Scaffold this active site. Structure first.
Site, PDB file in Angstrom:
ATOM      1  N   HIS A 163       4.696 -25.865  66.270  1.00  0.00           N
ATOM      2  CA  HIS A 163       4.887 -27.325  65.722  1.00  0.00           C
ATOM      3  C   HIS A 163       5.045 -27.221  64.143  1.00  0.00           C
ATOM      4  CE1 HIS A 163       2.650 -27.731  69.535  1.00  0.00           C
ATOM      5  NE2 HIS A 163       3.792 -28.033  70.027  1.00  0.00           N
TER       6      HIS A 163
HETATM    7  C1  FAD Z   1       8.100 -22.364  72.526  1.00  0.00           C
HETATM    8  C2  FAD Z   1       8.090 -23.800  71.987  1.00  0.00           C
HETATM    9  C3  FAD Z   1       7.597 -24.756  72.778  1.00  0.00           C
HETATM   10  C4  FAD Z   1       7.583 -26.066  72.334  1.00  0.00           C
HETATM   11  N1  FAD Z   1       6.744 -26.959  72.940  1.00  0.00           N
HETATM   12  C5  FAD Z   1       6.755 -28.290  72.607  1.00  0.00           C
HETATM   13  C6  FAD Z   1       6.145 -29.237  73.288  1.00  0.00           C
HETATM   14  O1  FAD Z   1       5.658 -29.166  74.573  1.00  0.00           O
HETATM   15  N2  FAD Z   1       6.273 -30.450  72.765  1.00  0.00           N
HETATM   16  C7  FAD Z   1       6.815 -30.873  71.619  1.00  0.00           C
HETATM   17  O2  FAD Z   1       6.717 -32.203  71.272  1.00  0.00           O
HETATM   18  N3  FAD Z   1       7.200 -29.889  70.798  1.00  0.00           N
HETATM   19  C8  FAD Z   1       7.451 -28.738  71.308  1.00  0.00           C
HETATM   20  N4  FAD Z   1       8.093 -27.613  70.387  1.00  0.00           N
HETATM   21  C9  FAD Z   1       8.752 -28.101  69.155  1.00  0.00           C
HETATM   22  C10 FAD Z   1       9.884 -28.541  69.456  1.00  0.00           C
HETATM   23  O3  FAD Z   1      10.885 -27.769  70.190  1.00  0.00           O
HETATM   24  C11 FAD Z   1      10.501 -28.769  68.180  1.00  0.00           C
HETATM   25  O4  FAD Z   1       9.757 -28.546  66.999  1.00  0.00           O
HETATM   26  C12 FAD Z   1      11.416 -29.805  67.826  1.00  0.00           C
HETATM   27  O5  FAD Z   1      12.716 -30.015  68.420  1.00  0.00           O
HETATM   28  C13 FAD Z   1      12.046 -29.962  66.435  1.00  0.00           C
HETATM   29  O6  FAD Z   1      13.439 -30.058  66.550  1.00  0.00           O
HETATM   30  P1  FAD Z   1      14.356 -29.765  64.993  1.00  0.00           P
HETATM   31  O7  FAD Z   1      15.733 -30.160  65.064  1.00  0.00           O
HETATM   32  O8  FAD Z   1      13.834 -30.371  63.754  1.00  0.00           O
HETATM   33  O9  FAD Z   1      14.167 -28.036  64.618  1.00  0.00           O
HETATM   34  P2  FAD Z   1      15.059 -26.949  65.300  1.00  0.00           P
HETATM   35  O10 FAD Z   1      15.225 -27.181  66.802  1.00  0.00           O
HETATM   36  O11 FAD Z   1      14.784 -25.908  65.043  1.00  0.00           O
HETATM   37  O12 FAD Z   1      16.412 -27.410  64.502  1.00  0.00           O
HETATM   38  C14 FAD Z   1      17.418 -26.346  64.173  1.00  0.00           C
HETATM   39  C15 FAD Z   1      18.784 -26.519  64.616  1.00  0.00           C
HETATM   40  O13 FAD Z   1      19.520 -26.113  63.384  1.00  0.00           O
HETATM   41  C16 FAD Z   1      20.371 -24.987  63.791  1.00  0.00           C
HETATM   42  N5  FAD Z   1      20.474 -23.983  62.591  1.00  0.00           N
HETATM   43  C17 FAD Z   1      19.469 -23.367  61.911  1.00  0.00           C
HETATM   44  N6  FAD Z   1      19.765 -22.615  60.801  1.00  0.00           N
HETATM   45  C18 FAD Z   1      21.016 -23.078  60.720  1.00  0.00           C
HETATM   46  C19 FAD Z   1      22.249 -22.522  59.819  1.00  0.00           C
HETATM   47  N7  FAD Z   1      21.904 -21.905  58.726  1.00  0.00           N
HETATM   48  N8  FAD Z   1      23.392 -23.055  59.899  1.00  0.00           N
HETATM   49  C20 FAD Z   1      23.636 -24.199  60.851  1.00  0.00           C
HETATM   50  N9  FAD Z   1      22.952 -24.261  61.813  1.00  0.00           N
HETATM   51  C21 FAD Z   1      21.362 -24.061  61.680  1.00  0.00           C
HETATM   52  C22 FAD Z   1      19.753 -24.532  64.972  1.00  0.00           C
HETATM   53  O14 FAD Z   1      20.698 -23.637  65.607  1.00  0.00           O
HETATM   54  C23 FAD Z   1      19.052 -25.621  65.654  1.00  0.00           C
HETATM   55  O15 FAD Z   1      20.172 -26.150  66.409  1.00  0.00           O
HETATM   56  C24 FAD Z   1       8.208 -26.431  70.940  1.00  0.00           C
HETATM   57  C25 FAD Z   1       8.735 -25.606  70.419  1.00  0.00           C
HETATM   58  C26 FAD Z   1       8.468 -23.984  70.637  1.00  0.00           C
HETATM   59  C27 FAD Z   1       9.326 -22.793  69.969  1.00  0.00           C
END
Ligand code: FAD
Ligand code: FAD
Lengths: 649, 649
Positions: B575
């Protein structure tokens, strides 16, 4: 916009040597591309003791291998044999490659390994000259001081060797058949000549010595310096600050901070290579004659697969666009060394234990290594080759240092904190490590620090509903590493047993006893081994044995309990190799099967792990690649006294 | 030649939503760039039960987080808190980001956290609309099967809450102020009403409930489907296989398998971005109006620093060519959660223990989360903010699951094998984790999987020769996470001691207690807490408060010994976020300081981690970004009855 004739990928332990010697003996163009940059003016790398964490910030005190600025971070997939842990192994960046961050230790491996485990054209009598060339080019030095414990250990080793000779067994860990009845143990007299373990002939394969050879040199001021590939072949005396050769080497150009990703092709001939620089623009350079890939064990298969050579199904599945040649053997059978540790505490009164545990302080000449010997196969090892009873093989590399080297978790669990100064450690490194793995690319876009690396070491065995005689060979094949570790522990226990009397009669009044593996367990293991004979390893699976007597059940419980230590209480050496071995991906001419003008000339191309550390082997492979490219045995017939000139600045 | 007006980087939990609602509410073309590709048809990601590893080859039994083709590998530098361990935290790749590989648990977070720890314009009464929008669009479901242990636990929690509210203490974990003197524990009657913890008014802060909410949907066949951002906003209905918009969405275009490296500038205005495609080629696309970066917690500061914004000293030292804004805060203060684990053993007749422990099997609707409650501060916590006696803060998230979730090393050490069918786990999550770190890049060439990530969790205290009067605040500041973990252990202990009586009264003749934390040690901990009150934590440094009392020696020893389990027996929840918070790098408009049209719209831009799981917060921030960019509160004025339609194929 540019052009060239020969391009080399990776200025490592073989790439720099190859580039220098190609520039020396040729008029054509040679270009060297390296991921990193020169570190000639850093106290962390230039000073040998900087490896130990001497010039580190108080808030970022991490080793050079653990800095993403210094080395690639090769994290691996979970090890099902090691409780799911994910060890990380590093390859250095910049001029000199991984030799920037190593312990600077130098060995050869012996003569037996290169004759009974390598293809024709790579026997010891064809690479002895290259070994000599590399060894005299580095010009190592030995240790300065002489600790009292080393003499006692050598005397105990001599006693053990004479006992084993008197017993008369077909093969033992402390027997050398190339020298006769006399043991190969250095004498305790002050005038005793050193037992050089990198001798030209190769007489010594099971030898008890007192000092290794490190790539460290003493300066005129009085302080030591670190000598590696980068500061030996890529100094300012040959290539200037701009990155071009000067005078005699005017045809050589080197570009730093350049990472390559793909090789342009014409169906079977590489037409160019593209690289990514700091600003992020990809340039095209023409290739006229040949290319050599020397990016290491972990990153040569990756660039090969991303280029369009490998298993067609996998590359098509992951989206690799261009496919050239089909080969399911690329990046397979990865080999590496593994070294457990053990701790021994001395007893008595503070004066004698202080005067006996002295003079092992680390200095740039011994690098903390005292060193005892390089033993052979144990007698009771089920897995020996056919020539074991006739020709001696290197199986264990024995090391001893000061203090305690263990991850802090086991230090807390056992309670042997480094506060106490009355205990030392020994490492029974395994140079015949059986398990092997493979490497697969993950995404065909950019080079990445983590490919799919699988490496399962201490895997257990599950019986099936099959006859026992049909299962025993499979158990023998699978349970080799546990047997090797237990035999090493028993060897160290016997060494301690002899050392007790040796030190008692040597004038010191101390008592030595094993502590870390809970020596009572070691005693039970020794008693069970002696009582049960060669069939001791059958008790790995109690059900198949079927014995129900208390002695058998307790032996089985102790054997199961002892298997816990090597999985966590150990270290994984960074001696990975054999990912593009000769005969599977390349022929004896260092040419990939199915290609026309590409070569691999690093430790990945090796056909077997040498019986020890793996630096001189990579340098030899580079030099032999130079000879094969040229066709004339220049390096074999060059005078010994001709060496490149050191240039600190 | 490809051009666009607004370019979004990263198809994560917020980029997909932002692109969807940009294409819906505007005619300007929007371009989305993602490193991965659609996984619509993969049974491993589509099937909710595939998260547990049901569709993997028998020889590559790894989860989706540890597979490089699915997620980046975030290896961090060793932390002195966990004996120098290097855990790896994964960011998902492809459509939906990390929502592809998460457990889909949805928690809003609460009201007090968004009102006391966030700036103006980001209070609860301004984000309730977007939270409701996200929850309605996802449309989660509750549990199906009801467990007998859940009712016993709810009654025990109710009894404990009654005792706490009768004691009249100023603050406790089981006290809520939006309800008054009545405990907020769901009834155990057969006709009980569900007690939603994500209510619109936010009056629910400390809630003892019986079921979480998961983002899964049941289908006509009878099987459930994982519902994430990908199939919700970027399914076949709006974007086809070729990634072009359908109907009104004709402006939108999504390019899969695209890794962006740097953002070019013209002094204060971005002009374009470049990415490396599947064929390893550089493409330049012109930018007209706006660029938004939502690459995630780990890769937003990395791209920002590699672009030319960040600390000038460090970037210049590494070798970054272009420098724009000197911000020493980019990538500072990284916040992440933590979760220790406990194991409880149930004693009794085998039929009783088999009947008691039924109906805890995992389903695609509960993911093994039976769910207990979200608790507040402990009454003996030395650290409490100013509003402790004004508003209620949630600190823990207690959960229960069948089986044993612990790394196999401690399972072997303690002998609590998962084969036994009389053990279950209670997890005292920590949603107010104190320590924080920072992120730094290592090489300015390509976006690398492993940057320099520093995160020290459990640091000890170093005594100094001075009166303790001026030393105690520093020790209190440094020793917060250990105190929180021990308080959570005590909370679980007393919850279990109430569990015993409740189960005895509920017709179950079973005795039960915890085993893994060495129940005698936790009993001594509880006795010492009761004896010493607010002076319990002074014994982390026995030298400063030494008394030579046998009780004092025992308390110090048992406090030192108990600190091992939080170090070893726990898992770092993924998280992570808040590394580019508001007020350090961006203003109330989520615009990068010192720039013109650069914005960050991910969890890294959050000013504080929400009190719970962090899936919904990223989408909330994305919706806020949409509203800020457009200028009209479209998403605040959209009727609830407008939801995008999901497309399974
Ligand atoms: C094992 C696990 C279990 C989890 N369980 C829960 C849960 O039960 N409940 C909950 O609320 N949250 C949970 N989470 C957290 C949740 O999945 C994420 O924290 C949340 O989706 C945040 O999304 P984000 O887009 O900010 O991050 P991310 O999903 O990491 O967004 C990054 C995105 O940008 C892309 N990207 C990255 N670098 C580049 C680049 N250089 N160029 C182009 N594209 C790029 C990636 O491919 C991805 O699509 C969990 C996470 C994990 C790993
Ligand atoms: C911590 C440590 C200690 C060691 N101690 C010893 C010891 O005591 N004794 C011993 O004999 N050996 C030791 N070794 C091993 C030794 O350092 C190396 O194995 C040796 O350099 C082998 O040569 P190499 O070509 O594989 O080196 P490498 O460094 O692996 O050569 C390849 C180099 O090419 C560059 N490169 C890689 N990929 C690319 C790319 N895509 N584009 C551009 N450039 C690229 C990198 O700089 C890389 O380092 C140690 C290694 C480590 C890590």
């Amino acid at each position: 916009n540019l052009t060239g004739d020969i391009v080399i990928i990776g200025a490592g332990a073989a790439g720099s040597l190859l580039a220098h010697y190609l520039a020396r003996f040729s008029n054509m163009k040679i270009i060297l591309l390296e991921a990193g940059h020169s570190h000639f003016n850093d106290p962390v790398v230039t000073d040998p003791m900087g490896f130990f964490g001497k010039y580190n910030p108080p808030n970022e005190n991490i080793s050079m291998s653990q800095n993403p600025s210094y080395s690639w971070q090769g994290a691996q997939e979970p090890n099902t044999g090691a409780y799911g842990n994910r060890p990380i192994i590093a390859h250095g960046m910049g001029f000199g490659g991984s030799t920037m961050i190593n312990r600077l230790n130098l060995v050869v491996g012996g003569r037996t390994v290169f004759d009974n485990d390598w293809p024709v054209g790579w026997k010891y009598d064809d690479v002895k000259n290259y070994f000599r060339r590399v060894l005299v080019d580095i010009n190592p030095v030995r240790d300065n001081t002489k600790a009292s414990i080393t003499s006692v250990a050598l005397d105990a080793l001599r006693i053990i060797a004479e006992q084993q000779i008197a017993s008369g067994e077909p093969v033992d860990f402390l027997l050398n058949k190339a020298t006769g009845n006399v043991p190969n143990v250095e004498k305790t007299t002050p005038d005793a000549v050193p037992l050089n373990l990198n001798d030209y002939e190769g007489v010594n394969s099971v030898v008890a010595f007192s000092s290794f050879y490190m790539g460290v040199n003493q300066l005129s001021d009085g302080n030591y310096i670190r000598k590696y590939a980068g500061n030996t072949y890529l100094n300012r005396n040959y290539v200037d600050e701009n990155g071009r050769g000067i005078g005699k080497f005017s045809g050589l150009r080197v570009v730093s901070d350049a990472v390559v990703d793909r090789i342009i092709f014409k169906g079977n001939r590489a037409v160019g290579v593209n690289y990514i620089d700091r600003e992020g623009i990809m340039h095209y350079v023409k290739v006229n004659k040949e290319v050599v890939v020397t990016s290491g064990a972990f990153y040569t298969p990756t660039i090969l697969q991303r280029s369009g050579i490998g298993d067609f199904t996998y590359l098509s599945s992951i989206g690799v666009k261009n496919l050239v040649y089909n080969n399911p053997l690329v990046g397979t059978g990865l080999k590496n060394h593994y070294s457990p540790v053990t701790i021994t505490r001395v007893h008595g009164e503070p004066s004698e234990v202080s005067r006996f545990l002295s003079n092992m302080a680390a200095n740039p000449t011994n690098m903390g290594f005292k060193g005892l010997a390089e033993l052979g196969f144990h007698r009771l090892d089920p897995n020996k080759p056919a020539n074991a009873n006739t020709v001696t093989y290197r199986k264990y590399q024995l090391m001893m240092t000061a203090g305690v080297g263990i991850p802090a978790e086991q230090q807390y669990l056992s309670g042997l904190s480094p506060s106490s100064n009355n205990l030392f450690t020994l490492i029974a490194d395994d140079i015949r490590f059986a398990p092997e793995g493979y490497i697969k690319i993950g995404t065909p876009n950019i080079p990445r620090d983590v490919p799919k690396i699988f490496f399962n070491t201490f895997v257990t065995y599950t019986p099936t509903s099959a006859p026992a005689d049909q299962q025993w060979p499979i158990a023998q094949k699978t349970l080799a590493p546990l047997i090797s570790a237990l035999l090493g522990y028993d060897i160290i226990y016997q060494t301690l047993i002899s050392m007790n009397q040796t030190a008692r009669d040597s004038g010191f009044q101390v008592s030595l006893e094993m502590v870390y593996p809970l020596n009572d367990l070691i005693y039970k293991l020794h008693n069970g081994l002696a009582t049960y004979g060669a069939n001791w390893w059958h008790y790995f699976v109690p059900t198949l044995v079927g014995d129900d007597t208390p002695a058998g059940r307790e032996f089985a419980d102790t054997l199961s309990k002892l298997s816990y230590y090597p999985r966590v209480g150990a270290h994984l050496d960074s001696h990975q190799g054999c990912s593009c071995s000769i005969g599977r991906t390349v022929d004896s001419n260092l040419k990939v099967i199915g290609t026309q003008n590409v070569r691999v000339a690093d430790l990945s191309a090796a056909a077997f792990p040498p019986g020890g550390n793996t630096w001189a082997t990579a340098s030899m492979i580079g030099a032999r690649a130079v000879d094969l490219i040229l066709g004339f045995p220049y390096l074999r017939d060059l005078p010994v006294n001709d060496v490149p000139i050191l240039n600190v600045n």
